[PDB]
Amino acid sequence: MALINPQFPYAGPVPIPGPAPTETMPLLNYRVEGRIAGIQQARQFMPFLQGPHREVAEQTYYAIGTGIQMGQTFNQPLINTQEG
């Protein structure tokens, strides 16, 4: 967006020496076929386990029984003959 100087104008570009025209043109680089080499193993001996863990520990229980329940020799009360 330059302003044209009317007192000192200039013309378009003139030819100048050039950079040997084939040396600015590249070759198209020619890929050969390739292979991810080797026979891959199916599994890996991992350093960490792959499953979930638990944040807190919960107390577990198992039921037990008591035993054969016996009789008893109670201390027996007195007879309510109007004193009680």
Binding site: L3, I4, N5, P6
Partner: protein, 49 residues
């Protein structure tokens, strides 16, 4: 030193000093300073300047 010091009898047209001792005169320094006076902030129409 060959222009500015004319002897007694020499042409003083382009000299600066003239006298009987003008043979042994010498410049020491000359300084110049150039200032350009121009106009900026030029008006611009729809067809340029």
């Amino acid at each position: 030193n060959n222009t500015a010091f004319a002897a007694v009898g020499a042409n003083p047209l382009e000299a600066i000093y003239q006298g009987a001792g003008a043979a042994d005169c010498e410049f020491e320094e000359i300084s110049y300073t150039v200032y350009q006076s121009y106009l900026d902030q030029l008006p611009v129409g729809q067809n340029g300047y």
